[PDB]
Design a protein around this ligand. Structure first.
Ligand SMILES: CCC1=C(C)/C(=C/C2=NC(=C\c3[nH]c(/C=C4\NC(=O)[C@H](C)[C@H]4CC)c(C)c3CCC(=O)O)/C(CCC(=O)O)=C2C)NC1=O
Ligand SMILES: CCC1=C(C)/C(=C/C2=NC(=C\c3[nH]c(/C=C4\NC(=O)[C@H](C)[C@H]4CC)c(C)c3CCC(=O)O)/C(CCC(=O)O)=C2C)NC1=O
Ligand SMILES: CCC1=C(C)/C(=C/C2=NC(=C\c3[nH]c(/C=C4\NC(=O)[C@H](C)[C@H]4CC)c(C)c3CCC(=O)O)/C(CCC(=O)O)=C2C)NC1=O
Ligand SMILES: CCC1=C(C)/C(=C/C2=NC(=C\c3[nH]c(/C=C4\NC(=O)[C@H](C)[C@H]4CC)c(C)c3CCC(=O)O)/C(CCC(=O)O)=C2C)NC1=O
Ligand SMILES: CCC1=C(C)/C(=C/C2=NC(=C\c3[nH]c(/C=C4\NC(=O)[C@H](C)[C@H]4CC)c(C)c3CCC(=O)O)/C(CCC(=O)O)=C2C)NC1=O
Ligand SMILES: CCC1=C(C)/C(=C/C2=NC(=C\c3[nH]c(/C=C4\NC(=O)[C@H](C)[C@H]4CC)c(C)c3CCC(=O)O)/C(CCC(=O)O)=C2C)NC1=O
Ligand SMILES: CCC1=C(C)/C(=C/C2=NC(=C\c3[nH]c(/C=C4\NC(=O)[C@H](C)[C@H]4CC)c(C)c3CCC(=O)O)/C(CCC(=O)O)=C2C)NC1=O
Ligand SMILES: CCC1=C(C)/C(=C/C2=NC(=C\c3[nH]c(/C=C4\NC(=O)[C@H](C)[C@H]4CC)c(C)c3CCC(=O)O)/C(CCC(=O)O)=C2C)NC1=O
Ligand SMILES: CCC1=C(C)/C(=C/C2=NC(=C\c3[nH]c(/C=C4\NC(=O)[C@H](C)[C@H]4CC)c(C)c3CCC(=O)O)/C(CCC(=O)O)=C2C)NC1=O
Lengths: 160, 277, 66, 162, 160, 160, 162, 162, 160, 162
């Protein structure tokens, strides 16, 4: 979270928190309810976001669900949608926390080794998360959309 | 007097007439069909050097000094363009190095300047304090270690994964991680086996202690360590110096502490960064 | 005779420093046999106290394989 | 390194003067463009691999001999070195765009880069062309207001190599 | 600067700036307007602040301007007040920059050796900086008083 | 090569070559003639090998040449077969060298970076390498087949 | 570094070409010479101390000024430095002979040796004389066939110094 | 030397290719800027002594130590040598601007110059500052576009001395 | 041995053995019968080789046995021949191992300081091992004599 | 580093000759001046800070622009580096005087100092003026003879820089 980031920076520099990051903490706690309402607005739209993103991904990449591809078959497409579920939940966690820390610590560290073990193509992941970004930004107003897109494109860059 | 109206000029080298001694090597470099291959002037430089103190130079010549860039180990070659200046630098000559940081933290004036408090002039320091037995500081320290030892990140196939795992797990310290990087086969390939031995010693010294060598005491010691024990001997000896222990203990990644005036000139004298009058 | 397991206490006698350094004073680490003589010397230089040393990886008294 | 704020601070400190109207105007001009710079930097960070893709593909389409036998980028190792150098250029152009200053380009990138490339045999013209290709590819993603900002730093790098 | 420090941290790690670092830069550029207002207010009042601080210091520590004192005489008192003006300008530079880096570079690194070569007492400098902080914070607003006093206390600790 | 690897392994510890290294070089120079014969038999028959290997690869992984696939289209398939020709040339280089060294520098360092910059799927590369190995071992006798298979196995594991 | 096999491989790799009859002829030549090279390498490894012994003694007998006071080899330090340089020369000539290529000599020894010796005040004529001493000393030990092979690398070192 | 037209000719000749649309575009760009280059060169040649006067005055006013005793420019001979160096920098910047390429700058100024100043003890930073002074003085006389063009080559000289 | 060296070299980079290391191990195990017959031949004739080696040393270096020397006396001569026994046993160890690691870490590591602590001349040691080489190669067959000779040459270079 | 005794030892070792009467005479002269040297060194050590204070005060009074904005000694950092350099010069001059040989100056002080200062931007002439002011201050404290002795080393430093 933002508080954790400020505390670890202070501890690394071995001094108390300055008025600047104290103001950072005040601003973060002042915006908590907006983060929670954004987290809901994403949460009711789980199925619509995930299914639209999967449809767009397999529109751009028919080879993935083509015979011989990674997502060929109903069960493997279900696993695709479940991975998108994981990443949408992680984006909600990041929005609530104020930074991307839950996103990496749960789904970015070691993701390349995991998906190499799973024959999962990383370009497919980045296209899927870009589709989820485009879908999720439409659900929100501009002020919410910008911050949510920050988490989404951080995740896209990390997957790439 | 020598040729007159009707005689073609000839080279007046040894045996034709009396030969000057003060320009011997330069003159017989000039009486060579490879003289046009050298574009740096050699006589103005020579006659200026006869009347001035020693330059800021590696004790084994200017071709032994690498460019102070992030990565690469770029040296001047004797053969592509001679451009070679030899200097009678003795064994007790101590080079004048410039601090990459607080000027009065230089070891020549302040012997305790290595353990001095870091200013904002100094580079970023990476230290591993994480439980020394989820943390992004460990990965930051790993990347900083790769950035110091190699100057850059390596490709995925080249990572010392086992040493990294031992690093976040706490079995080995940052110093042992740096040692595993510097004694690795990839470091030997990149910075040892394709270079003149003293060039490799100089570059490795700069990567590991963060400063050029001071003179022929250090270069000769590491040269004899090469002679006796090889690349591993040189690298382990540099890491086993006391100076390393005071400036970089077991916890902190090495960083650049000194530059040469040429390396400073590379950054400061670019048209953007020159101080405007 | 490959790996030693060394625990030691190294107090600070030259400075008073305000960062976190509990990990630097008391620590248990694995040192190679070839590294251990120099490591023990360096620890004794700094005024540290060596509490216990144990053979871990290799086998004591191996005429070969070390 | 030196950014726009530090550049103004230094140019006034060397004079010994306090901030006057011109100084505060320069500081205002920097602060006004901060949101644009941060948004562009975020976009470039999230799309760096795509930018390198498109610039490399364009460069090796215009000059296919670079990646074919006898070319400087012909091997997996040398192709990797090429795309790595392009990534370095993109990262430092983003840094220079955030800073509002070209100083970091001079003191972390262009210092001895031309002589290093001459030593290595790296073709300078082809590297300048790759930097230009990164410039067009980035301009599409960031938008015109940020494209103009990235253009000056890409041109600074190109003139440094050239 | 905040931007310089974020860029240097990202460059040291050979990475692009993270969402947290961009968030710090975003907050800094947002606050730049009021920090410029604070710096301009502190600049317009330089003569008043320097004069009032000088009289407060010399009445609080008469031995500096007494015969045999460091600042005794017109020229030495002028040099005293000129150092005060230097440090006021440095505080304004720190105000605009967002951190104490200009102060450190221009007037904190090597300050003790310089004043030791000048026979200038360091407690006198510390009390002079304290008087400057008192005068400046008294003249300007309470909300900006904390921000300005942060840099003033940094300087007071550095010269102490 | 064997000589190069032995010499660098000797030089790194500043010694002359040990009896084992000299014996290894002796074995290599004794097997040189059959190595050249294997390099022959792979070299003349390579139009065949490339065609059968590509056909088998696209049969076992139709997704690559399905719409949305990497090798979709005549020209990208041509680039695919060109890469296969590259790697089989590297294999003959390794056979003559007696080590996987020329393979390693020419086509293993940074290969993941390059096939990410091209989004060539590494599992497809590995499948193509197995296809080339099977086709090539088909045209060699058992003693030659095992030797070429070691180099193909190294290539496939390296791309994996 | 580079040996004969790697030299042929790199030539055909830069040409993007295939191993033709000429390449296989060169490979056959190296494999034919390999056993002689290995025997010579083992012999030189056996007698390296003896070769340095005799070459140093002969060089200092032909030019006794070096070891008398005022000579470049007059001290324990400078004499040991001379012996260390000669031991390098022998070891690296043996490496080049076993490889069949002088690239290792170039990059590891000759790139920077002239300037090092000129800065140190080391006589280069006398160093070439010492190299020739090692040459004809090891020629007797390795035999005429192996002497003809090691001689070209000793002459390469001498020509690089001269 | 080499100019823009010769640069394009050489780039296409090494490839063995005939001129295509990109090469013709580059040639057309040079032909478009030729008239501006000629005007700037004539203006500079008319005012070279002036530009040297203000640049030297600026440099020696901001750094008076250079011309006091113990300074590098302290004598009539050394002051004349300094102003002669500035004159040559200006002339070759004009040559490069007319040619459109920095090849003459390298060949006739920058090859071996840093070594010469290192031997002579010349402060290269002060020389670069004098070059920057000549740049700003020249720009005012030549106008906006001519100033940008001339500043390209002045900055090339300054970075080459680096 | 060869297997140990290959395994440690491969594990240095945490990777499986290269086809080059597999090939050197294959050549080592292929030649086990000849080297084990060599071990037979050497261990059967230990006393003879040791005796002629001592005689050749004493005739080549009458210095050692003469009064005031290291080997003067019956006990010191016995220690001389005992060391020759040790070293030929180590040579057999290296032959069966295929690598000089047993010789290295049993009789080579620390031998210089050791014969310094015994006042034993190292030229005497090299003369001893040369005599041992001559005597052993005289008895062995043409192909086996060379293989024994390379290990003896390694030992000679190791001592001095 | 070599003193008078070491210089005699080396000039007799190069010849290979033992000591004779002349060497003993030179050594006796050095011991004759040794008491003066030790007293001067002790006096200078006792008052190093004072000497630096008047020397820097005189230099900055004679050249006020140095410590004003735009001068090379305008910062606490740069002022501290300046007085640090002055301490270097005093300490190494004391070393050279105590050794009776100017070798240490060439050996540890004047080597690459011109290039270092020219890369930093330090005024060489003003540093020489600081050295001369330090000479004047040191002479009054050490007395007439010790001043004449220290003057040769101060003049050596000033001529080495200039
Ligand atoms: C919260 C952090 C987390 C993540 C992200 C995660 C991913 C993950 N995905 C898996 C399988 C899978 N994942 C995918 C999805 C991929 N297929 C491609 O077409 C798409 C580009 C892409 C999805 C957008 C597929 C198809 C599989 C099945 C692969 C197989 O079983 O062979 C599996 C193996 C378990 C299973 O089969 O159900 C894991 C662990 N696990 C975690 O603990
Ligand atoms: C003005 C300063 C100056 C000096 C000093 C100088 C020395 C000098 N000595 C030379 C030859 C020589 N010099 C010597 C002298 C040495 N032989 C030894 O026995 C003795 C220790 C010593 C005599 C005391 C010899 C023997 C040669 C001939 C070298 C040859 O041709 O083989 C040569 C080359 C021939 C020529 O003059 O054209 C030079 C240049 N040259 C100069 O311009
Ligand atoms: C951030 C977490 C952290 C903690 C908690 C910590 C404690 C700590 N205290 C230490 C020494 C010490 N600690 C004390 C304090 C004790 N003296 C008594 O009077 C008091 C009852 C008591 C303090 C209230 C003293 C006196 C020493 C010096 C060692 C000695 O001489 O006994 C040391 C080792 C020597 C050194 O300072 O380098 C540590 C590691 N270090 C850490 O990094
Ligand atoms: C000798 C070392 C070396 C190698 C190996 C190498 C490979 C290489 N492959 C390339 C493109 C390509 N490579 C492939 C191959 C893929 N198609 C399918 O996905 C398969 C999984 C796989 C082949 C089995 C394809 C389809 C392209 C074209 C990509 C595009 O259209 O942009 C390119 C880009 C430029 C060009 O095509 O010439 C290179 C440099 N270059 C080298 O210097
Ligand atoms: C961060 C500042 C910095 C830079 C930029 C830098 C450049 C640099 N590029 C290098 C290699 C390379 N760089 C390139 C890229 C070029 N050649 C291609 O044709 C392209 C046209 C072009 C890129 C667009 C290539 C192909 C190599 C391989 C050359 C070799 O290794 O011999 C190397 C050699 C060291 C190594 O590869 O590890 C350096 C030092 N060094 C630095 O310290
Ligand atoms: C921007 C960083 C910077 C600083 C801070 C700075 C301070 C500074 N103050 C100086 C003089 C002085 N400074 C003082 C000030 C002292 N008088 C009282 O004791 C007070 C405790 C104290 C002031 C509150 C005095 C009295 C002098 C005159 C010293 C003399 O001439 O003997 C000098 C000597 C040169 C000169 O007079 O111009 C410097 C360099 N210079 C810098 O470049
Ligand atoms: C000033 C420093 C210095 C020293 C000391 C020195 C010693 C030295 N001893 C030498 C030979 C020798 N030294 C000795 C002495 C040994 N014989 C017995 O074993 C004794 C144990 C011992 C004497 C007590 C002998 C017999 C030789 C002749 C060896 C030979 O000619 O091969 C040589 C070779 C002479 C030449 O090549 O012309 C030198 C240079 N050199 C120096 O630059
Ligand atoms: C592996 C490539 C390599 C080589 C070869 C190399 C040579 C080399 N020889 C050196 C010294 C030396 N080398 C020699 C040898 C010469 N003088 C004698 O008269 C002979 C004619 C001749 C040898 C046959 C001597 C006498 C010194 C001592 C120089 C001195 O101490 O001033 C030194 C400097 C040691 C120091 O700092 O004092 C180097 C670097 N360096 C390298 O990196
Ligand atoms: C014992 C041999 C030796 C010398 C002489 C030496 C000088 C020296 N002075 C330096 C900085 C400096 N030196 C000065 C001094 C100048 N300021 C004024 O102009 C004066 C005229 C003049 C001094 C009297 C200054 C201001 C700096 C700071 C430069 C900067 O930070 O940009 C530096 C670079 C920073 C560092 O100390 O690492 C060196 C190396 N170093 C040595 O190892």
């Amino acid at each position: 979270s933002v508080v954790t980031k400020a505390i670890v920076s202070a501890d690394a520099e071995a001094r108390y928190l300055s008025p600047g990051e104290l103001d950072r903490i005040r601003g973060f706690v002042s915006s908590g309810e907006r983060r929670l309402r954004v987290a809901q607005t994403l949460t009711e739209s789980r199925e619509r976001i995930i299914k639209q993103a999967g449809d767009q991904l397999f529109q751009k990449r028919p080879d993935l669900v083509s015979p011989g591809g990674n997502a060929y078959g109903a069960e493997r497409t279900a696993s695709c949608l479940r991975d998108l579920d994981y990443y949408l939940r992680l984006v909600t966690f990041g929005i609530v926390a104020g930074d991307v820390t839950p996103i990496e610590e749960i789904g970015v560290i070691g993701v390349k080794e995991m998906y190499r073990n799973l024959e999962v193509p990383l370009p497919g992941m980045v296209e899927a998360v870009k589709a989820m970004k485009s879908v999720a930004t439409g659900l929100l107003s501009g002020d919410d959309s910008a911050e949510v897109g920050y988490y989404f494109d951080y995740l896209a860059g990390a997957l790439a | 007097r020598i040729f007159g109206e009707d005689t073609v000029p000839f080279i007046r080298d040894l045996g034709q007439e009396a030969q000057p001694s003060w320009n011997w090597g330069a003159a017989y470099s000039l009486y060579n069909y490879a003289a046009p291959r050298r574009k740096v002037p050699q006589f103005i430089t020579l006659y200026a050097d006869y009347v001035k103190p020693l330059p800021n130079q590696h004790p084994y010549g200017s071709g032994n000094d690498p460019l102070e860039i992030q990565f690469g180990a770029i040296f001047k070659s004797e053969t592509k363009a001679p451009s070679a200046r030899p200097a009678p630098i003795g064994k007790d000559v101590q080079r004048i190095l410039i601090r990459s940081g607080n000027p009065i933290t230089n070891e020549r004036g302040n012997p305790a300047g290595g353990i001095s408090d870091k200013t904002s002039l100094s580079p970023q320091i990476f230290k591993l304090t994480q439980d020394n037995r989820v943390e992004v500081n460990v990965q930051a320290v790993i990347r900083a270690a790769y950035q110091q030892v190699f100057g850059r990140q390596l490709y995925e196939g080249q990572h010392l994964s086992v040493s990294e795992i031992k690093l976040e797990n706490g079995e080995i310290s940052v110093k042992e991680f740096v040692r595993d990087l510097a004694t690795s086969e990839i470091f030997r390939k990149l910075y040892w086996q394709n270079f003149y031995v003293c060039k490799s010693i100089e570059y490795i010294h700069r990567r590991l202690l963060g400063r050029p060598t001071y003179g022929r005491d250090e270069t000769n010691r590491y040269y004899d360590l090469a002679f006796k024990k090889g690349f591993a001997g040189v690298v382990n000896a540099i890491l086993d110096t006391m100076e390393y222990a005071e400036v970089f203990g077991d916890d902190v990644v090495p960083y650049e502490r000194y530059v040469t005036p040429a390396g400073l000139n590379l950054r400061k004298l670019r048209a953007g960064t020159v101080p405007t009058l | 005779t490959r790996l030693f397991k060394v625990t030691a206490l190294i107090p600070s006698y030259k400075k008073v420093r305000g960062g976190r350094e509990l990990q630097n004073t008391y620590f248990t680490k694995l040192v190679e046999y070839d590294r251990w003589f120099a490591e023990q010397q360096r620890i004794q230089k700094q005024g540290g106290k060596i509490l216990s040393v144990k053979m871990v990886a290799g086998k004591p008294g191996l005429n070969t394989g070390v | 390194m030196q950014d726009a704020i530090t550049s103004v601070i230094n140019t006034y400190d060397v004079q010994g003067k306090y901030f006057d109207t011109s100084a505060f105007d320069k500081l205002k001009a920097y602060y006004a463009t901060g949101e644009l710079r941060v948004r562009a930097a975020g976009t470039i960070s999230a799309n760096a691999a795509t930018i390198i893709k498109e610039a490399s593909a364009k460069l090796f389409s215009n000059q296919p001999d670079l990646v074919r036998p006898g070319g400087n980028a012909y091997t997996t190792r040398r192709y990797a070195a090429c795309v790595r150098d392009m990534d370095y250029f993109l990262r430092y152009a983003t840094y220079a765009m955030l800073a509002g200053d070209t100083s970091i380009l001079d003191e972390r990138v262009l210092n001895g880069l031309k002589e290093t490339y001459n030593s290595l045999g790296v073709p300078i013209s082809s590297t300048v062309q790759g930097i230009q290709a990164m410039k067009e590819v980035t301009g599409s993603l960031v938008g015109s207001g940020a494209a103009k900002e990235m253009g000056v730093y890409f041109d600074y790098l190109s003139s440094g190599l050239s």
